[PDB]
Design a protein around this ligand. Structure first.
Ligand SMILES: Cc1cc2nc3c(=O)[nH]c(=O)nc-3n(C[C@H](O)[C@H](O)[C@H](O)COP(=O)(O)O)c2cc1C
Ligand code: SF4
Ligand code: SF4
Ligand code: SF4
Ligand code: SF4
Ligand code: SF4
Ligand code: FES
Ligand code: FES
Ligand SMILES: [Zn+2]
Lengths: 186, 107, 117, 234, 425, 89, 107
């Protein structure tokens, strides 16, 4: 699903940030003063960070602040892949499956994570804690496996190291960069 | 091409010699326009003399047609001159098909 | 494969096979077939007016060939004799749909028609 | 005004004139999908590709202007190899509606396959289908028949006023619909069905009533609404 | 004539210890006041005299591209554009040029600011790489407040302000026309390239598109001598570019190397899987995702330079090694590369939305083995066609690797079809 | 269903107070059996596994051009252009 | 013998020509045509290459019924070869193929 939007219990109810409203207005000033539609691309990323799972009515309220077309601003977030579509948990992680990562085994890291953290691949956790989704590329391809959770991307993980990092993340943040070898040259 | 083309042009240059030969006489009374396409020859004739064109091709040393067999006419309202009587001629000794047309309105 | 009196076929689970295109209308060299289409109740859009003249029609099988859904299939028919033109020219489907008595033969004949002979 | 020869014949054109606009002066119509009359110039199909006298890559007629005195051929060897190819790409993911489809002969895509595209075969297996978009009174819209172009997208933004149509996905899943469930406004948006080349947007009031084949056309000015003239009635 | 690898020479060396002041001791903003005092014509001439090729996956020279705008007379104020997000998979330049040393990337906008003549500089980062984007935002706060760039800094009349914006993470950072449309606010789709480039009109302004590695090389080329950048490499293409190896390898690591370097020597230094080209079957690609895979026979003769790489099969543009072992599948690997373009297709040009999606569906059948032996030759005609009749360069990027299946290989593809023909049918 | 005397078939009117119809008096008028399209709804809906399903009457033998039908909305099942057959999930 | 239509001269033909222009000799040649016609039919049975029935190019002849139902371009061409005609090249052409009565000079 990409085009269709549900009308039941996620169409009318929406909330906007009040404390971050002053910070959102300053973000619009960073671009051009006259004719500013660039703020809509920045506010869409700020809305997902402040409130989990962006509503259809929430995008219309964000478009009203910058004063833009409601249909055009809704289409702007549809093309983006980083923005949330339906629902996201407390810490959502996306796994890379592209050929630069698949050459040194990437599917083995995803299959081990699927059995340890439950569910198939597309389905999220029923208690809402971890959500799995297939990603194109994480960005940094220096390490053989790559997975980006929430904001900080975790790189370089073994078959048992990936399962140990996932279970520990339930209570306390695990930080990390490439916990397998030197960062620059090894 | 194997199925796309019907026949390659080889006799087209040979039939073009007739497009020169009759035109070498060069009458404003007879010749006017000579069109040749798809192994066939087409001539249109000035209304003043049609009989002298038909006595030609009949007998003649270079080409022997004789049979002035099939005779058609074209109705077209686009031009200022309306009708176009079209003669279809066939040779038995020479084995060729030539066309004689009239350009006049012929009301 | 033999062409006689016209009869329009239907699907095995009800439903009229004719979809209303005006495809067979334009191909028809006699212009015997007439078609005016309206939406059927709700959703479906399949025919309203469907007259084939027997005063016209030179029997080609062109309407059989032009049909993408295979509605008009020419059945082995000989028996047709009337007192008037009115009784002879076919009405809005109905008598064409009454070709069920020949549709059992048509279903057998079309099995020799798919991948031609 | 700078003159540049197209198909050997010379034609005078303006300095900021388009390639397809220059082709009209030479009495030749290139294969189109994105308008040239009133709708804004945009790519997003690459059908109107034409090859220059000395160029490695073909340029689109809607975007690229003539500018300098360069020779461009419409019946070139590279153009015919292009036109047959693009048609196959358009029909690899096309739902096959032709007998059921509201248009038939009036469809611009239907003619271009007969005139330009490859006839003998089309290599395709498995076509994706899109869900039906919501529409009010006029135009019974079907998203499957749509080729996903930019014609009606810019029509709502510029010509009609109120914007609704846009993009929904990324790959072969992007719909031309409104995304949010809302009926289209009246004003002048009833003419959107006549704009679209494919049989996707067509008037619901006169749907499947009569095909383009066998209909006598006559031009007459409309009585309802003032300043209305030239309207063809079948 | 022969090029040596690095040998105490690097564009960006600081990666272990760098914040703001620590980088300054190890060559950063050394001639900041000197470059600002110099004229715009003289500063632009320094890049043209060196002859540095474009770091981004295109092949176009950086000297000609920066001079293409020039700006003789401008009505609307000019703006500077820079791309830092990851485009092609297998590239490590995105999380190294900005993540490790953020001070070097910020200095690149200031060096090209006075040269091009832009009022404000803008940078686009990947949405997935949020940790790397935070380092770039922290560097801007340490530069604007202290007095590095903005209004009047380091004895300069021209004003330049740096601002970083988070991206969607698709083809919006890919094409040069796409970056202008994404930053403006509109949906992720590239503008028409034939009539107007970046110089004529980009977000209502004259602009220029620059890569993350291309922009970072500009202050290093300005501070040091012009001959130093042209010393390593070939006559046509010169300048050190960051190459990253990913896939089947003993140790995967990204390291800076000199131009016109052999593929056998570069793989041996980083250590690959089994053998460099004796025991393990060679399936390495010179590019990240754009260029098709190189043959097993021709690999030692191939060079890192773009001018030398064009002679054999296809030129390297992205400059990233994607080596695959003999045990690893070849058919399934290249099919996944096309599947990347299936998701990263924007939705404009009809031989790409309904093209690549058609291409991936046929390619998925080759893994199973249901495809006919005749279908291999037919697919080659379609693959060549997409390269020519597309607006953006991603249409070419999906077209090239499919051409590398018919070329070089072919018995490998035929064996998969023949195996399922006897077993199932 | 029949109005007065004549039976309606595939949406048809007989006569307004008997004026037009006069020929069908001595001879019995034709009527198509089950022309109300009751057999269309009588057929059971088939379950789908994929997001898009291809429809066919009975291969190349029976006249049915291939159309792909999308299934995205839970309410109202999707049907092909040629058949009255509906698909869910 | 003079003008081939569809694979001629390859098939052996025998043409009966009499002497007198009377009704009896003009009848004998027709019976002699009939006895020397089976030679052609037998040679037609001898030479039959298996292949295409219609022209493969779908701008002239409608495609196969199994073909049109699946592929796209086939049905659109099926929609336009019917209703609409052929879109013929302009020009005047004359053809005559031997009728047993005489000729069919279609113009
Ligand atoms: C598939 C693909 C992805 C690309 N991704 C990027 C990218 O993420 N960043 C970038 O700077 N250039 C990228 N490029 C190169 C662009 O063509 C670039 O905008 C420009 O033309 C190269 O010049 P530059 O090195 O001055 O940026 C990509 C090219 C292709 C074909
Ligand atoms: S008989 Fe066939 S071609 Fe004619 S309208 Fe009905 S479905 Fe269409
Ligand atoms: S058989 Fe020929 S004349 Fe008769 S209805 Fe069909 S197309 Fe028309
Ligand atoms: S859109 Fe045109 S080509 Fe496609 S099915 Fe409808 S009429 Fe045929
Ligand atoms: S509905 Fe028509 S005009 Fe609109 S995008 Fe689709 S094909 Fe183009
Ligand atoms: S080639 Fe593909 S990705 Fe590039 S602009 Fe065209 S449709 Fe979009
Ligand atoms: S018709 Fe010119 S780009 Fe679509
Ligand atoms: S390809 Fe996996 S992180 Fe880039
Ligand atoms: Zn069906």
């Amino acid at each position: 699903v990409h085009r269709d939007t549900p009308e039941n219990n996620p169409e009318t109810p929406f909330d906007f940030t009040p404390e971050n409203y002053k910070r959102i207005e300053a973000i619009v000033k960073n671009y051009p003063e006259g004719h500013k539609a660039a703020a809509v691309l920045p506010v869409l990323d700020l809305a997902q960070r402040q409130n989990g799972w962006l509503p259809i009515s929430a995008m219309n309220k964000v478009a009203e602040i910058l004063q833009v077309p409601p249909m055009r601003v809704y289409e702007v977030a549809t093309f983006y892949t980083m923005y949330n579509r339906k629902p996201v948990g407390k810490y959502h992680i996306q796994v890379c499956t592209t050929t630069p990562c698949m050459l040194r085994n990437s599917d083995s890291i995803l299959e081990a994570i699927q059995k340890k953290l439950g569910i198939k691949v597309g389905e999220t956790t029923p208690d809402k804690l971890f959500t799995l989704i297939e990603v194109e590329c994480l960005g940094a391809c220096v390490n053989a496996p790559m997975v980006q959770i929430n904001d900080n991307y975790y790189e370089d993980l073994t078959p048992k190291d990936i399962e140990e990092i996932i279970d520990e993340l339930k209570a306390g943040k695990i930080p990390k960069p490439g916990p397998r070898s030197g960062r620059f040259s090894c | 091409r194997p199925t796309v083309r019907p026949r390659n042009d080889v006799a087209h240059k040979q039939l073009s010699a007739f497009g020169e030969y009759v035109a070498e006489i060069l009458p404003k009374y007879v010749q006017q326009v000579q069109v040749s396409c798809f192994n066939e020859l087409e001539i249109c004739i000035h209304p003043d003399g049609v009989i002298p064109v038909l006595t030609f091709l009949r007998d003649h040393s270079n080409a022997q047609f004789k049979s002035l067999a099939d005779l058609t006419a074209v109705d077209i309202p686009t031009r200022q001159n309306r009708f176009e009587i079209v003669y279809n001629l066939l040779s038995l000794r020479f084995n060729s098909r030539i066309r004689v047309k009239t350009y006049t309105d012929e009301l | 494969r033999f062409r006689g009196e016209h009869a329009l076929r239907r699907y095995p689970s009800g439903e009229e096979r004719c979809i209303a295109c005006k495809l067979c209308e334009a191909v028809c060299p006699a212009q015997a077939i007439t078609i005016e289409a309206e939406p059927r109740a709700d959703g479906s859009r399949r025919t309203t007016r469907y007259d084939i003249d027997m005063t016209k029609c030179i029997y080609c099988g062109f309407c059989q060939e032009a049909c993408p859904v295979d509605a008009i299939v020419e059945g082995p028919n000989f028996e047709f004799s009337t007192e008037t033109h009115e009784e002879l020219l076919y009405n809005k489907e109905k008598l064409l749909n009454n070709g069920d008595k020949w549709e059992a033969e048509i279903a057998a004949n079309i099995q020799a028609d798919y991948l031609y002979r | 005004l700078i003159e540049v020869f197209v198909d050997g014949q010379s034609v005078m054109v303006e300095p900021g004139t388009t390639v397809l606009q220059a082709c009209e002066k030479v009495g030749m119509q290139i294969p189109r999908f994105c308008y040239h009359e009133r709708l804004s110039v945009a790519g997003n199909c690459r059908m109107c590709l034409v090859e220059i006298e000395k160029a490695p890559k073909v340029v689109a007629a809607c975007a690229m202007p003539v500018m300098k005195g360069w020779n461009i051929l419409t019946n070139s060897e590279k153009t015919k190899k292009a036109r047959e190819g693009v048609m196959e790409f358009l029909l690899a993911n096309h739902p096959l509606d032709c007998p059921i489809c509201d248009q038939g002969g009036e469809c611009d895509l239907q003619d271009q396959s007969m005139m330009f595209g490859s006839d003998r075969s089309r290599f395709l297996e498995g076509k994706r289908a899109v869900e039906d978009k919501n529409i009010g009174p006029l135009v019974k819209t079907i998203m499957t028949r749509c080729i996903q172009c930019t014609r009606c997208i810019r029509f709502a933004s510029e010509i009609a006023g109120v914007d609704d149509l846009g993009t929904t996905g990324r790959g072969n899943d992007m719909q031309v619909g409104t995304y949010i469930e809302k009926m289209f406004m009246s004003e002048l948006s009833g003419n959107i069905i006549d704009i679209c080349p494919v049989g996707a947007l067509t008037x619901x009031x006169x749907x499947x009533x009569x095909x383009x084949x066998x209909x006598x056309x006559x031009x007459x000015x409309x009585x309802x609404x003032x300043x209305x003239x030239x309207x063809x009635x079948x | 004539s022969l090029k040596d690898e690095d040998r105490i020479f690097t564009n960006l060396y600081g990666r272990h210890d760098w914040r703001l002041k620590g980088a300054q001791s190890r060559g950063d903003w050394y001639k900041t006041k000197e470059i600002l005092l110099k004229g715009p014509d003289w500063i632009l001439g320094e890049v043209k005299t060196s002859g540095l090729r474009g770091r981004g996956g295109a092949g176009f020279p950086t000297g000609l591209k920066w001079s293409f705008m020039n700006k003789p007379s401008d009505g609307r104020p000019k703006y500077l554009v820079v791309n830092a997000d990851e485009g092609e998979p297998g590239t490590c330049k995105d999380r190294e040029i900005i993540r490790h040393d953020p001070h070097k990337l910020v200095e690149g906008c200031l060096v090209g600011g006075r040269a091009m003549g832009a009022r404000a500089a803008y940078i686009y980062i990947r949405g997935e790489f949020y940790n790397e984007a935070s380092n770039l935002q922290v560097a801007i706060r340490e530069a604007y407040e202290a007095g590095l760039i903005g209004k009047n800094a380091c004895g300069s009349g021209y004003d330049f302000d740096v601002f970083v914006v988070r991206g969607a993470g698709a083809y919006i950072c890919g094409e040069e026309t796409a970056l202008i449309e994404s930053i403006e606010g509109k949906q992720g789709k590239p503008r028409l390239k034939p009539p107007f480039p970046a110089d004529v009109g980009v977000f209502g302004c004259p602009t220029t598109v620059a890569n993350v590695e291309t922009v970072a090389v500009s202050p290093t080329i300005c501070r040091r001598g012009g001959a130093w950048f042209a010393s390593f490499g070939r006559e046509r293409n010169s300048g050190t570019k960051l190459f990253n190896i990913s896939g089947h390898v003993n140790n995967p690591c990204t390291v800076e190397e000199e131009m016109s370097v052999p593929l056998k020597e570069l793989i041996e230094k980083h250590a690959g899987g089994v053998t460099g080209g004796w025991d393990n079957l060679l399936a390495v690609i010179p590019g990240g995702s754009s260029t098709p895979l190189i043959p097993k026979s021709v690999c030692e003769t191939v060079l890192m330079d773009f001018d030398a790489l064009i002679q054999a099969q296809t030129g390297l543009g992205t400059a990233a090694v994607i080596v695959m072992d003999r045990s690893t599948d070849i058919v399934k690997a290249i099919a996944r590369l096309i599947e990347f373009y299936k998701h990263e297709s924007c939705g404009q040009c009809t031989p790409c939305r309904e093209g690549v999606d058609w291409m991936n569906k046929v390619m998925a059948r080759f893994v199973r083995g249901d495809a006919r032996p005749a279908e291999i030759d037919s697919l080659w005609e379609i693959s060549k066609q997409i390269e020519g009749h597309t607006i953006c360069a991603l249409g070419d990027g999906a077209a090239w690797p499919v051409q590398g299946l018919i070329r070089h290989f072919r018995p490998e593809l035929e064996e998969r079809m023949q195996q399922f023909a006897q077993q199932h049918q | 269903x029949x109005x007065x005397x004549x039976x309606x078939x595939x949406x048809x009117x007989x006569x307004x107070x008997x004026x037009x119809x006069x020929x069908x008096x001595x001879x019995x008028x034709x009527x198509x059996x089950x022309x109300x399209x009751x057999x269309x709804x009588x057929x059971x809906x088939x379950x789908x596994x994929x997001x898009x399903x291809x429809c066919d009457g009975g291969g190349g033998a029976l006249g049915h051009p291939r159309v792909y039908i999308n299934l995205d909305k839970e309410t109202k099942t999707g049907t092909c252009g040629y058949c009255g057959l509906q698909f869910r999930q | 013998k003079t003008q081939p239509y569809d694979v001629y001269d390859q098939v052996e033909f025998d043409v009966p020509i009499g002497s007198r222009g009377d009704c009896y000799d003009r009848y004998l040649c027709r019976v002699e045509e009939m006895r020397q016609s089976i030679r052609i039919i037998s040679q037609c049975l001898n030479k039959m290459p298996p292949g295409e029935i219609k022209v493969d190019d779908a701008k002239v002849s409608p495609p196969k019924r199994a073909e049109m139902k699946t592929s796209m371009e086939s049905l659109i061409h099926h929609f336009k070869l019917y209703t609409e005609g052929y879109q013929v090249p302009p020009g005047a052409t004359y053809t005559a193929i031997e009728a047993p009565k005489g000729e069919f000079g279609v113009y």
